[PDB]
């Protein structure tokens, strides 16, 4: 109902030649600037620094000759204003009382004082924007459908938003320091490769064909390696047309990273440093406070284990690349399609879930890692690692497969379970230097670091 | 045919227990590093700095006991190697001759010398990747279908790639210095607004509905302003499902920028500074050399003109918001749907095309600018500017419309030519502070700056 009373104040403001949505108000300072400016003012004293401030009125308290309000700047910083009859008022004071509702953006020019709390006493004031909706005084799913309100009302929403931003910047900063070049590769592709997922498809009017939103940048990033990029990354959305859960969303921001003349051993080190550097820059500790109340320590060195041996220890018997699917099925049964899949699942069900401290698992089944080079010495496994951090499957790195003939096979096997990515394969046949790539999810990153859900870490999900 | 001879060398290398795609080669330096290290070496003298280098063999010259090759590192830097019988050879020399074709990535450990040109004489050497395709010794449309080869063979492809990267970084650096925060807003939207374009649509399996790839981030970026972001930008792809031409592609990278408590006058200034700063960082001059052979000067201050007056001067009569479509049709006819459209078209046909120096045109027809605030004083126009740089329609800035009721109208008018963006409108009714937004295309930016076509400025178009 207050919807309608607010709409009428708009109408009657227009009519009176007051401007409720003016083009310009001469804001001299953010409220934060005024605070940092007057840190320790003798309380109940005036100073002749005149400012023009603007802010959301989130608290009113009217009292005849004198009205107080809390201006909250968009970052959360607060300044109190005092609308007084004696300063420049009467009609001003009336208009204040009549015109100014909660959630209204307001500008006030005046002197900076402290009251019997840091305030601005007003010479001038003006509405900067009239709200036709009061703030609520929130369920998780209304906070997310209306992030703009969440951000106005809930400090933590403000902090998380800025945290993601700072994390993302930390990442770019870390990679740039190391000489990585950030490239833009295509989102719309004639066929979407680089990972295991069902694509989003869209019809192009230009070309009268379907195109596919990228599931991952790998294959184009690999083209950049062919083309002589020494060190490239890309930090941007990918689209996997599948179901949503606590670690999975159909649209999400992902980092991929490619470095010539290093292996999975090298990118493991960088990934660790990168994450640690992000924590330091964006969180300021490696002793990560959780909503739990607990503390997760990501400092120091991180353990590396091998999938097959670690699984072997867990299961009480030697599991190798040679172990049959009939054997693995049986073990699987005893607990409650193919070899590679069974190993990963058994590993995930036994070793995976038990990991607390940050851990790399390396040396993966060849069948489930089409894009990663075969191990330099161990038969039947690929040089891939996964990083688990706080129990979250965070990141992966590969010693990348550059052999076009092997690579054509790996894809043929895939397809039989038949048009391949011929251009990708062509690029490889021009020669790709030995190189190691990583992938890492930003939401999972933030999750692993903070305890926040995926639906808190993106500004505008659905 | 050489396709097949190369494939056989792979096969016979495998067979002999040589590794043609090894996991790791111990590369100590980039060729650029070795160059910077030995800038002025007395030519035809040896030095006992041992290095391990790796590079693409792009030139061979075999001669009995001694073979020379050019290693080109991926950035374009060149080092010559000398494969000699006397160093560590005979069988080595034979294998070199037999095993190493052009476009092969090769590693060589050895001493750094200058010959009778900076070279490495080899103790050791190894194939790092075997190419199953020779380099061509290129049409514009094969360069772009195979950028990876373009990048190997054509220096200018290398330079342009790195230029775009440096421009994009320059942009982020410039905006960050000014306190802008880069946000990620959704690419997949329930309805795609913020501009005039037909969307790409994609079916979601998760939600069993169509989604729309964003045509622009504005409406979500505006939500961020509501939510208290003072200064936000987003630099990322947008998708407009329309035809391709020399200034238009269906997928392209675009910058949008939002700043609270400034107007179009303010963002005009920033846009100018931003562009000038980009030129300085990424190109190193504001006297822009063109393929033409000419020089385009983007230094100093840029002229601002008004659409209606400038058109009036061009046409020899007063054109105002009040001029009828019947009048404009007639004028249009005399040269060779609605008022706003006719003004822009007439303006573009008369004043637009005649502009050489960098120029802002401001004060636009209300009918064609649904999202921009009405002018503070001039009836019938909005506070929008377009920037033309080197004749290219580069950028725009608005004093943003924050009035939810006016905004609902503007959208209603649009739709009648009927479901609106209710959530966007809801956000506005929570109150958006006065603010100015800009948009700018990266490809157009690069084009305006360099003379390069849109099909050179993106790494992987199609
Ligand atoms: C929300 O994040 C994700 N959403 C989806 N749908 N899928 C994935 C993620 C996500 O974070 N992923 C990681 C990306 C590479 C790093 C290794 C672990 C995962 O594959 C996969
Ligand atoms: C290649 O760049 C573009 N491709 C398409 N399809 N459409 C546009 C571009 C492109 O650069 N645009 C600008 C974006 C905002 C700045 C004002 C001028 C244009 O609208 C529009
Ligand atoms: N494309 C991978 C990430 C890169 C892995 C290293 N080449 C994924 O989506 O899983
Ligand atoms: N969305 C605009 C760019 C931002 C204009 C300022 N609000 C466009 O695509 O034209």
From Swiss-Prot, chains A, B:
One GO process term, biological-process aspect: lysyl-tRNA aminoacylation
Catalytic activity: tRNA(Lys) + L-lysine + ATP = L-lysyl-tRNA(Lys) + AMP + diphosphate
Keyword Iron annotated: no
MF terms in GO: ATP binding; lysine-tRNA ligase activity; magnesium ion binding; tRNA binding
PROSITE patterns (alphabetical): AA_TRNA_LIGASE_II
Pfam families: tRNA-synt_2, tRNA_anti-codon
Matching PANTHER family: LYSINE--TRNA LIGASE, CHLOROPLASTIC_MITOCHONDRIAL (PTHR42918:SF15), LYSYL-TRNA SYNTHETASE (PTHR42918)
HAMAP family assigned to the protein according to its UniProt record, in alphabetical order: Lys_tRNA_synth_class2 (MF_00252)
Family: Belongs to the class-II aminoacyl-tRNA synthetase family.
Protein name as it appears in the record: Lysine--tRNA ligase 1
Organism expressing this protein natively: Mycobacterium tuberculosis (strain ATCC 25618 / H37Rv)
Record gene name: lysS1
């Amino acid at each position: 109902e207050q919807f309608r009373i607010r709409r009428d104040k708009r109408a009657r403001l227009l009519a009176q030649g007051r401007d409720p949505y003016p083009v310009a108000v001469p804001r001299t300072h953010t409220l934060a600037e005024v605070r940092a400016a007057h840190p320790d003012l003798p309380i109940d004293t005036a100073t002749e620094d005149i400012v023009g401030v603007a802010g959301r009125v989130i608290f009113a308290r009217n009292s005849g000759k004198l009205c107080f309000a809390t201006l909250q700047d968009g970052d959360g910083t607060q300044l109190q204003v005092m609308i007084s009859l004696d300063k420049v008022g009467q009609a001003a004071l009336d208009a204040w009382k009549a015109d100014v509702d909660l959630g209204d953006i307001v500008y006030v020019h005046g002197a900076v004082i402290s009251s019997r709390e840091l305030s601005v006493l007003a010479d001038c004031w003006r509405i900067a924007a009239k709200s036709l909706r009061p703030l609520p005084v929130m369920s998780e799913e209304s906070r997310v459908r209306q992030r703009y309100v969440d951000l106005i009302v809930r400090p933590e929403a403000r902090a998380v938003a800025r945290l993601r931003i700072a994390v993302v910047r930390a990442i770019r900063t870390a990679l740039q320091r190391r000489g990585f070049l950030e490239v833009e590769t295509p989102v719309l592709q004639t066929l979407a490769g680089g990972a295991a997922a069902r694509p989003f498809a869209t019809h192009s009017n230009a070309l009268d064909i379907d195109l596919y939103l990228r599931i991952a940048p790998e294959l184009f990033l690999k083209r950049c390696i062919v083309g002589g990029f020494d060190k490239v990354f890309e930090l941007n959305r990918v689209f996997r047309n599948e179901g949503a859960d606590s670690t999975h969303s159909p649209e999400f921001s992902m980092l991929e990273t490619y470095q010539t003349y290093g292996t999975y051993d090298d990118s493991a080190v960088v990934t660790r440093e990168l994450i640690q550097e992000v924590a330091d820059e964006a969180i300021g500790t490696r002793q990560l406070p959780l909503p739990d109340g607990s503390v997760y320590d990501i400092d120091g060195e991180w353990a590396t284990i091998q999938m097959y041996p670690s699984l072997s220890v867990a299961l009480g018997e030697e599991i190798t690349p040679q172990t049959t699917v009939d054997r693995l099925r049986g073990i699987a049964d005893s607990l409650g399609f193919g070899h590679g899949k069974l190993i990963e699942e058994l590993w995930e069900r036994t070793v995976g879930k038990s990991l607390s401290a940050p851990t790399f698992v390396k040396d993966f089944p060849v069948q489930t890692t089409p894009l990663t080079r075969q191990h330099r010495s161990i038969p039947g496994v690929t040089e891939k690692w996964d990083l688990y951090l706080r129990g979250i499957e965070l990141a992966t790195g590969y010693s990348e497969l550059s052999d076009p003939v092997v690579q054509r096979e790996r894809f043929a096997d895939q397809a039989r379970a038949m048009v391949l990515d011929e251009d990708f394969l062509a690029a490889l046949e021009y020669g790709m230097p030995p190189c190691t790539g990583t992938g890492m999810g930003i939401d999972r990153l933030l999750m692993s670091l903070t305890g926040l859900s995926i639906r808190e870490t993106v500004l505008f999900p659905i």
